[PDB]
Amino acid sequence: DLADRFAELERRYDARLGVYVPATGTTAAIEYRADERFAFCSTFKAPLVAAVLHQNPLTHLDKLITYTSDDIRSISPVAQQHVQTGMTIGQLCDAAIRYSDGTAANLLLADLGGPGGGTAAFTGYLRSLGDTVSRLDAEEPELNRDPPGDERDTTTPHAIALVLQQLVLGNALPPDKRALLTDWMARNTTGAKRIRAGFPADWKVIDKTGTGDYGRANDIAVVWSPTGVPYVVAVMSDRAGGGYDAEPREALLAEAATCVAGVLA
């Protein structure tokens, strides 16, 4: 019966909705278009920070990276201010998650090394977690522009939710590194009107947003009930019917999160 409300929200916004909440000991898994491919957009910037933390010790965050003004080719509120001074790997992680900095994301990919600017290394990291579906193929800002139906730079609510589960609630990272990733996601500034807006204020919310063309708007989050019970929420949406210039609807993600909160209560 919850599937009829999701299909009702799809009618209201002219969108395609993907939702997945992994099942716990007391609740059944919520699925709606869970195993259908959706575009990553900025969603990968959360497991990417975990990938750099995974292959390098904590002192590697102090290595200073220098770049030129020609390297800034996407939304970069922080990288635009340090083209003369440079930015350390640690500040690049903080900028990539808390501000969705596109230039810091591309530099992190080059820090991962390998073919394709690091896209092969990143997909290789996801496979080590058990995700044999998702794949990253391009860098910013091209990874938001793939046409509908293309399998490049895609994930599924089923796949990305289980990856986020291991990184925040699981053992994919040691505790000291797990604390830095969770704290950055906790001080995010770009998700105030999506999943966070659909849950009551006494629920703690950490999230990482994504936005692209074709009206694509994603938000992946970990929420804590007022008692302290954790859940993983993956909400993804696109509006392919409207073309390349379709505007994303933030209210859709906030509404669907209220539907999930009513079930988990």
Q: Using alpha carbons, select from 203, 220, 225, 217 the residue that is nearest to residue 246.
A: 217
The SS3 assignment for 135 reads: strand
Neighbours of 59 (CB within 10 A): 8
Active site residues per annotation = 42, 140
Q: Are 183 and 208 in contact (CB under 8 A)?
A: no
Whether a cis peptide bond, with omega within 30° of 0, leads into 141 is yes
Give the chain's length: 265
* Helix/strand/coil for 8: helix
**Tokens linked to 51:** 């990938």
Resolution value, angstrom units: 2.6
Structure tokens at 133: 């579906």
The DSSP 8-state label assigned to residue 28 in this structure reads P
CA angle 27, 31, 34 (to 5 degrees): 140
After which residues does a break in the chain occur, C–N more than 2.5 Å? none
Tokens of 200: 């009551």
Cα separation, 147 vs 129, in Å, equals: 27
Task: Please identify which residue in the block is written with the tokens 């996801």.
Answer: 126
Question: 254: helix, coil or strand?
Answer: helix
221-230 as b/e, with b when 16 or more CB fall inside 10 Å? bbbebeeeee
**Strand residues in the chain grouped as ranges (E):** 16-21, 30-32, 38-39, 64-65, 87-88, 154-155, 204-211, 217-224, 230-238
DSSP letters, 60-128, are GGG-EE---GGG--S--TTGGG-TTT-EEHHHHHHHHHHS--HHHHHHHHHHH-SGGGGHHHHHHHHHH
Residue owning tokens 């379709």:
246
In order of start, what are the domains of the chain with their CATH numbers? Answer: 1-264 (3.40.710.10)
Classified as helix, coil or strand, 170 is coil
